[PDB]
Amino acid sequence: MKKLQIAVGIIRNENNEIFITRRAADAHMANKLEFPGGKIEMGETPEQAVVRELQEEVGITPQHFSLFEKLEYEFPDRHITLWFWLVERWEGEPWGKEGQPGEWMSLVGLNADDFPPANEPVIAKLKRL
Ligand SMILES: Nc1nc2c([nH]c(=O)n2[C@H]2C[C@H](O)[C@@H](COP(=O)(O)O)O2)c(=O)[nH]1
Ligand SMILES: OC[C@H]1O[C@@](CO)(O[C@H]2O[C@H](CO)[C@@H](O)[C@H](O)[C@H]2O)[C@@H](O)[C@@H]1O
Ligand SMILES: [Mn+2]
Ligand code: NA
Question: Where does Mg(2+) bind (predicted)?
Fold first, then answer.
């Protein structure tokens, strides 16, 4: 079974809102809300991966970020390890740089059902902040 290491950024502004994108209709976890992120490539670290992925997907460079959660999830056809980085400082303004929907969402209003099931404990822990 496919095994993947995924790095994602929880992009939180000063108003307790998170920058959330929506996955394509033909992707794994299609139409789900998501933290921007992607696969950690050979020869790059989890910290380098979250920087690169956020630069590619939403056009910001995260800085002074921290590991919020690391967890593993077994999907029906793949196993992934998710590295959830809390990003509270960055250069740039996040946008749909890859043409994907993106918008700021209040932390209190997040609905874990809208995200891949792997995100359930992370969304709960975020609302604990
Ligand atoms: N980018 C991103 N991927 C996620 C999240 N939660 C989650 O289970 N995934 C899974 C979906 C995909 O199988 C994989 C991400 O790979 P791509 O972003 O390259 O599609 O990780 C998330 O919050 N953000
Ligand atoms: O692993 C993140 C963790 O490390 C600290 C230092 O203790 O931050 C360092 O690592 C981050 C990821 O590369 C950098 O963004 C940061 O600048 C660097 O100091 C903690 O702040 C953080 O919890
Ligand atoms: Mn991605
Ligand atoms: Na990507």
Answer: 37, 57
What is the number of structural domains in the chain?
1
Which run of H or E residues covers position 49? helix 46-58
Which tokens belong to 15?
């108003």
Alpha-carbon gap, residue 96 to 62, rounded angstroms: 16
> How many angstroms is it from 95 CA to the middle of ligand 3?
14
Q: Determination method here?
A: X-ray
| Ligand 1 atom 19, closest CA | 38
The alpha carbon of 72 and the centre of ligand 1 are apart by a number of angstroms equal to: 12
- The reply to whether 103 sits in an annotated binding site is no
Provide the resolution (angstroms).
1.9
Task: Report helix, strand or coil for 108.
Answer: coil
Residue with tokens 């939403």: 58
Domain range for 31 is 1-129
Q: Report the C-alpha dihedral over residues 110, 114, 117, 121, rounded to 10 degrees.
A: 0
